Assembly symmetry: C3
Homo-oligomer: 454 residues x 3
């Protein structure tokens, strides 16, 4: 957890480095099953409370099976996924859906049923060429047919004991909650709950997945994050089996360097009303080296940071050439056309970084950094400035209070003239929402083609 | 499920056709009731476990009623709802809220109470002129007053049986979960859960709704989607009645043609850095014919597709003239000013379509389509291109893998010169976020007014 | 609830006034504890159902503790937060996280354990200088060790009674649900559920908070809204204690004037295709006076309105000078550069306001306001227009139906020439996504510098 952060005064941006990747590139699919009983009506006509109680619970079981059948008519299941508007589009659950489709082919559910006759965990080779870990997590068929129905049948049906009511409730419990979870999510859930897959089942699954021991260690040390990036997909009710697919991430990029880019608006600071111009670097977000290029995540919130490990889904990334990082040290470089937006919107704001805070202070806004016991320790002047988190608790910009992160690291302030000062405001192309350094230079040049004749 | 898709090479867009609409235009409101008991304290002072267990459960009932009362002080309930930023604004639950308001008028709850004295389902004519289907789904008044309180009262209060504890838990159960659901959603829930309305209640409701048998068949064949587009709204606790309103969709547009427009960026492909220009059709999303015009849904994710049926809420649409579809076959037509955005952002990306994939490949990005067993079957060259899903499993653009849909349909590739090539890059108005063909032509012409004197 | 609304025909905007603020400026943190038992294995080897039932429930307890331990390895917990893209960035849960960190220091959990030995509620002075209200809401240590384990131990372990199974289920219940809630939210939940903190605990907490009696009255009269703006943060499992932090809002701005600005597009109405220009005021949202300036909430949906009280979080605001409100009465004023976007997008739409509706009607769109019993009572002509909610039930724009709010107030229609008519369309800078009155004037002037030589 050796984090280093550099602030660039010239471009009102800061880069936090020292992070290591865990990027999801693949999917592991597993089939989870519950064995069901094919009983729709019992010939018990008693009146006492125990009788009604078993009937109520059997009604709950039967209405769960029916709800799961109505989830099946809304199948295929549905799910999908500053510069976020450019992201590509595809379904996040295509892999799971392909496995569900295979489970509909004659014999396939029966093959899984036979693999789990004598064990609750087995690898099965499906017809489409995937080997999947399959589980039987609950056997309501044996419980209803062999432990409950003999009580209700071979004797007067009122002769049960209140313990069997309570046991049947406990056996039905996990089925009703899986059904509930699927019913309010249209058969596709994320994060993966402990009712879809318990911790012991999930850790067992990870341990038997066709991945390296390092990947197994990563996933087992970060179970919650694995759950947040996993899906459960309702598949089929068929031949007295309920089957659903769990889709777990495979982190095909691990331990490459990652860095987070924070950006804020950089405006001129004249007092005259509406006389100021602005630019903001629009390439903020997470960056991870990946296979000769760089995976860029423009909605930074899509990545989950655990200490110095950054977990992201590659479906939330744009693939950029590695020269994009030159924008941090030389925004005018000729190898990559660095992205900016221009405006005359000089509204104050702050960004809390990994190890400090950037503050864009304009007009009359009060912008300060404080220590809870000592008072104000820094006051920001008009323009874009930075403070490390050392000795600081909070940053106030106008009426809003922000808390800095408490992590201790290394901070570097790179001094430089704000680049907004290099532009002639009479010819600056303001109000460009998605622009770049070259486009702006090109426009300035063109509109200095009139001033030529002068 | 006869889907047809056409790709237009000239404009980097594809249209999937063969879909049929189901658009929500109206709302059906129903009042769901639970009968409650007005008991706040029992004079039972025993010490054994059964006693405490009944007291705990009565405390749960009483705290549910209190939580429902605090939901009532946060009433009226609150809910609402590329070109999505233009959508109009209004409340999705105004109809339900109007019914809740009527339930507060003297006598109204009593009228419903009297309609349900002898039946659990009845149509009631409210004072505001709406006839609503009303339900009594749980009678905790009769259970507490007539089956539970005689046990706790007319005898020593320790003489209960553990069955009555379990029965009281089961009777209280649905009340506690409805209360829980409302409590973490500020009294307004969507999707409609099976605790708000069970499958049998919902199917009963649909069957008695004042709609045609075709609408009843649609809704009954697509219960999950109906639930996703329905609301439950907490209304009142009054005169020993809990009442909430369920608001179900009415699909007033059915079986008209719908088509989905996919678009991707179309840039020039010079090697020179920052020398390329781009345009993207901004009118992507779902389109359905509707009442002489066309309902356009710019956040395509707002529509739920079930096979070839497309379910959408008209509140998520813009109403356009039917000439908008000319943009697909003739983007330069003079009847509708086709919408585009311009830029110099030549970042690679892909869109998975209904029957294939569009790929915008720029710079050095590796863009390919593969079959899992055969390897790469297509490589995309710089520019905008398309592949059908026939014989294809996946599309890779840089570091991101996408899965194509597996549905088989008809695919047409319409060859044509990319229209970005028609523009002189020295005068192209780049970086226009919300533009159109005419605005761009108008700007080019103006800025060719200087080159005149030359 | 004296609301007044003014519509400005000149700028296609309306301002609803008469509201009073409740802005969250601070956070109150409280530590909630559950006492746990350190038992992982019982030497009971029986076979009957009661035995298994206790073992199942003990397994549930133990798997809850383990799940809470895996939530701890994904700690620090994670949470954060038209002109919304300008908002600053920081963590909403920094205060709670600082308290969690302190609970990890030697002796700190023990200090809380000793403060709650004889009471379930006490104020405790933590090592970092915060006094926190701490609660013990469940004592599973005493229940397992002193009421359950003697039954399973000092006698044959099959001698329990089914009541103790049911009592143990009821005692374990709240622990399992808190664990479930944390497990699918990565240890950070909002809204604050009744399992994290019951109504009686929450009202007790408010009553003992170091705030004024007016703040206590506000919070106690609006519990649901307090819950929606609160967080629960999983902290630690240590020394047989589960501890989590609840973070409640402190409304440091109360009863200052608030007003809501509604805006819609204002376009010219020529029949000629693609010949029209448009502008829209981009400063729509909620505004509250606050400390000499004005807190502006651009994603209006971030504020919760209860009658005439407006509850917002200052982290969702931009701090503006109070001259921003001049844009409502004089959009050309020289004290504040009023914000607009320009385009040629003349697509029809509506905004339902507090007391009426704005309608932007263009092209051939049918735009009307109706009364359910009387029919159409107003038809909107091309351009931007307004109707109050008096005698109106609904507004239709094309294919979409909107319901007006039913609240009765005062409505003022300020007549004035649409300002879009003042611009020469040949020189209007269209397609500016984030602009202002001055930038537009400046551009018009420059591009009238060519027409000079003429
Ligand atoms: C002399 C000078 O200022 N040149 C600038 C330079 O930024 C740009 O690269 C060049 C054309 O490429 O035209 C302009
Ligand atoms: C001759 C020529 O290229 N004309 C173009 C045409 O696209 C446009 O329609 C016209 C004015 O409407 O001016 C320009
Ligand atoms: C005479 C006239 O129309 N002037 C306009 C005015 O809107 C603007 O303020 C001025 C420079 O500030 O130049 C232009
Ligand atoms: C931490 O990492 C930075 C960057 O690699 C390096 O400069 C520094 O020497 C490292 N220090 C320690 C103590 O690991
Ligand atoms: C499918 O629909 C398309 C478009 O209407 C039509 O061209 C084609 O003939 C149809 N084919 C079948 C087999 O239905
Ligand atoms: C309501 O408030 C408005 C604005 O302050 C004021 O003009 C009016 O006189 C008030 N009327 C009543 C009845 O409170």
């Amino acid at each position: 957890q050796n984090i280093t952060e550099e602030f660039y005064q010239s471009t009102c941006s800061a880069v936090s480095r020292g992070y290591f990747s865990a990027l999801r590139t693949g999917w592991y699919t597993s089939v989870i099953t519950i064995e069901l009983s094919n009983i729709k009506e019992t010939k018990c006509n008693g009146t006492d409370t125990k009788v009604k109680l078993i009937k109520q619970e059997l009604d709950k079981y039967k209405n769960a099976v029916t709800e799961l059948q109505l989830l099946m008519q809304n199948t295929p299941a549905a799910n999908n996924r500053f510069l976020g508007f450019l992201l590509g589009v595809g379904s996040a659950i295509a892999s799971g859906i392909a496995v569900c489709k295979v489970l509909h082919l004659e014999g396939e559910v029966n093959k899984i049923k036979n693999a789990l006759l004598s064990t609750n965990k087995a690898v099965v080779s499906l017809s489409n060429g995937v080997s999947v870990l399959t589980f039987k997590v609950l056997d309501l068929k044996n419980y209803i047919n062999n432990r409950l129905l003999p009580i209700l049948n071979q004797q007067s049906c009122r002769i049960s004991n209140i313990e069997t009511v309570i046991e049947f409730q406990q056996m039905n419990s996990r089925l009703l909650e899986i059904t509930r979870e699927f019913s309010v999510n249209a058969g596709v859930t994320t994060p993966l709950s402990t009712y879809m897959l318990t911790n012991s089942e999930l850790l067992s699954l990870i341990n038997d997945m066709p991945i390296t021991n390092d990947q197994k260690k990563l996933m087992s040390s970060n179970v919650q994050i694995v759950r947040q990036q996993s899906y459960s997909i309702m598949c089929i009710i068929k031949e007295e089996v309920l089957a659903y697919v769990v889709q777990l991430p495979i982190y095909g990029v691990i331990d490459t360097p990652c860095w987070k880019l924070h950006t804020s608006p950089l405006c001129t600071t004249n007092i005259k009303e509406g006389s100021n111009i602005c630019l903001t670097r629009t390439d903020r977000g997470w960056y991870c080296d990946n296979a000769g290029s760089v995976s860029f995540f423009p909605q930074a919130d899509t990545c989950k940071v655990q200490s110095n490990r950054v977990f992201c889904d590659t479906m939330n990334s744009l693939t950029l050439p590695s020269e994009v990082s030159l924008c941090n040290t030389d925004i005018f470089n000729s190898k990559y056309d660095c992205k900016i937006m221009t405006s005359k919107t000089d509204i104050s704001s702050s960004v809390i970084t990994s190890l400090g805070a950037i503050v864009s202070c304009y007009g009359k806004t009060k912008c300060t950094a404080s220590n809870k016991n000592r008072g104000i320790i820094k006051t920001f002047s008009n323009g874009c400035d930075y403070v490390s988190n050392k000795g600081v608790d909070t940053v106030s910009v106008g009426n809003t209070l922000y808390y800095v992160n408490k992590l201790e690291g290394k901070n570097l302030y790179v001094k430089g003239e704000p680049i907004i000062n290099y532009y002639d405001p009479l010819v600056f192309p303001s109000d460009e929402f998605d622009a770049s350094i070259s486009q702006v230079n090109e426009k300035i040049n063109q509109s200095l083609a009139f001033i030529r004749r002068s």
